[PDB]
Write an enzyme that holds these catalytic residues in place. Structure first.
Site, short mmCIF file in Angstrom:
data_model
loop_
_atom_site.label_atom_id
_atom_site.label_comp_id
_atom_site.label_asym_id
_atom_site.label_seq_id
_atom_site.Cartn_x
_atom_site.Cartn_y
_atom_site.Cartn_z
N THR A 31 -9.97 -10.78 42.56
CA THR A 31 -9.74 -10.44 41.24
C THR A 31 -9.43 -8.61 41.20
O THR A 31 -8.55 -8.34 40.68
CB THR A 31 -10.64 -10.60 40.40
OG1 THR A 31 -10.85 -12.01 39.90
CG2 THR A 31 -10.58 -9.80 38.89
N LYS B 35 -14.40 1.67 38.27
CA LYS B 35 -15.79 0.84 38.66
C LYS B 35 -15.35 -0.54 38.84
O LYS B 35 -15.88 -1.44 38.23
CB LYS B 35 -16.89 1.08 37.54
CG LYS B 35 -17.09 2.46 37.17
CD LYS B 35 -18.54 2.55 36.21
CE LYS B 35 -19.37 3.65 36.31
NZ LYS B 35 -18.32 4.81 36.16
N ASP C 179 -11.97 6.42 37.23
CA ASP C 179 -13.21 5.88 37.39
C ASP C 179 -13.32 4.52 36.75
O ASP C 179 -13.72 4.16 35.69
CB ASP C 179 -14.03 6.76 36.40
CG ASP C 179 -15.40 6.49 36.48
OD1 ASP C 179 -16.17 5.61 37.23
OD2 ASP C 179 -16.27 7.23 35.68
N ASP D 145 -15.91 -6.82 40.57
CA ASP D 145 -15.49 -8.23 40.49
C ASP D 145 -15.23 -8.79 41.91
O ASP D 145 -15.55 -8.22 42.94
CB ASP D 145 -14.11 -8.63 39.68
CG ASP D 145 -14.22 -9.84 38.81
OD1 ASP D 145 -14.65 -10.68 39.27
OD2 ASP D 145 -13.89 -9.94 37.64
#
Ligand SMILES: Nc1cc(=O)[nH]c(=O)n1[C@@H]1O[C@H](COP(=O)(O)O)[C@@H](O)[C@H]1O
Ligand SMILES: Nc1cc(=O)[nH]c(=O)n1[C@@H]1O[C@H](COP(=O)(O)O)[C@@H](O)[C@H]1O
EC number: 2.4.2.10
Lengths: 257, 257
Positions: A99, A92, A90, A95
């Site tokens: 990246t 998330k 997880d 960006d």
């Protein structure tokens, strides 16, 4: 009329990772994802082993592990294979594409090397998915897009949620579903995983809000419950996992009616 | 009337971390933040030391360092103190409050132990800030809220951006400003830091979009440019850093009158 998990595993447009998941859900009669929110590798692995038979998926935050090593993740993969559950980190990702590609492949964690599934926020635009998918495609990995969040004040609503669903549709070779509070897509090849789940009404002291497995699976139409403290905080985590598994599984069966 | 960085450093409601930053910006005549996007500790340290005199801030992605250790951080802090720049870990916390608290304080990276600044997406609601601040306030740290993003298809626009500004206003004991493409707050106590900056028009192959330092600082009213590849890919990284510093600094001076 709602298809079973086993049938959805066979859908024409199904991603191989989603198919493996759906197959083991059907086999094991579980739509429970354990949110293994612990800081010790030993506790992570002991929960993975004891609760493995009860879960379809184990969700990690490896950045909270105090004693992370790649050998710990190797041991977790062994338990995942033994007990038949997917590993979902997880992370998330949230960006620009250039990246997140590096954050997924590289660094200390080498997340793509061990996580079957990861997730991404849609806020950066679809470059976030394109960057991840370059890494995840040869590795036959999948991604979940965060369409809704469980916490108070969430901005993942309205057109934001709609944008997540569109992004998923447009990247269906890599995106296998959603983190959401409810069904957000009518396409059955997409998984819906729902965190902010406990048997009791309540919340926490930092904006988390809970709904029951029956509400989330039965009325809101989601597929899998993600449960952390509702299980982790119990004295007997196995009994708690079983309570959650039976709740979510029977709500799912109800909905097939 | 627009105030200099040095005067903003003295504002009554200024956060101590913003004040420290603003004073060194004034002192060194630099509003350049190096985005130290490298995969090796040696390169992070080599660039920090060489470019330290030219920058007000070094932005890290520690999760992309193949050989991260806390000893690398310790060295980086030594350089930051020697050369006078802040360390900003671009972690983009973006989970529920209870989770980000752990991700900021704990795990292998111990981000709060070394990062002067971190950033957060506002999508989870203000619990993301509340969780961070429980760790960041005791450690005398600051946070930037991601109000806009540079990448194609960004959803951080309109009401989402406004929500970020409100959340910052309301958590000013910890939130010191924004990642944004332009000035989004009229309050001079808040910093605006803008990535997606290169001298030439262009983008990358994964949705990055560039604007110039003059456009961002001068026309759009931001305070600090964040520059990665524009510097690190250049043959002469020292000369490149100096060109970006001079560009951003004279855009600031002009705007100031
Ligand atoms: N990924 C998430 C999206 C979300 O909207 N809410 C949420 O709680 N999570 C995660 O699910 C878990 C919920 O845990 P608990 O509230 O059941 O303990 C935590 O690890 C959260 O970071
Ligand atoms: N934090 C960011 C927010 C953002 O909107 N855009 C952006 O590029 N970044 C970061 O800035 C840097 C831009 O680098 P470059 O495009 O100048 O190489 C990268 O580290 C990105 O992750």
């Amino acid at each position: 009329k709602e298809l079973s998990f086993g049938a959805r595993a066979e859908l024409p447009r199904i991603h191989p990772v989603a198919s493996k998941l759906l197959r083991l859900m059907q086999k094991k009669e579980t739509n429970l994802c354990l949110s293994a929110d612990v800081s010790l590798a030993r506790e992570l692995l002991q929960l993975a082993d004891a609760l493995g038979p009860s879960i379809c998926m184990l969700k990690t935050h490896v950045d909270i592990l105090n004693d992370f090593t790649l050998d710990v993740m190797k041991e977790l993969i062994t338990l995942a294979k033994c007990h038949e559950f997917l590993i979902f980190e997880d992370r998330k990702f949230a960006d620009i594409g250039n990246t997140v590609k590096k954050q997924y492949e590289g660094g200390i964690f080498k997340i793509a090397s061990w996580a079957d599934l990861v997730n991404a926020h849609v806020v950066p635009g679809s470059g976030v998915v394109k960057g991840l998918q370059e890494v995840g495609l040869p590795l036959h990995r999948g991604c979940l897009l965060i369409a809704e969040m469980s916490s108070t004040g969430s901005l993942a609503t309205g057109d934001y949620t709609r944008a997540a669903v569109r992004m998923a549709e447009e990247h269906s070779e890599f995106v296998v579903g959603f983190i959401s509070g409810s069904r957000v897509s009518m396409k059955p090849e997409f998984l819906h995983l729902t965190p902010g789940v406990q048997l009791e009404a309540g919340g926490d002291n930092l904006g988390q809000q809970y709904n029951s497995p029956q509400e989330v699976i039965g009325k809101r139409g989601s597929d899998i419950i993600i449960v952390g403290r509702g299980i982790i905080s119990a004295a007997d985590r196995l009994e708690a996992a079983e309570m959650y598994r039976k709740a979510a599984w029977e709500a799912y069966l109800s909905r097939l009616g």
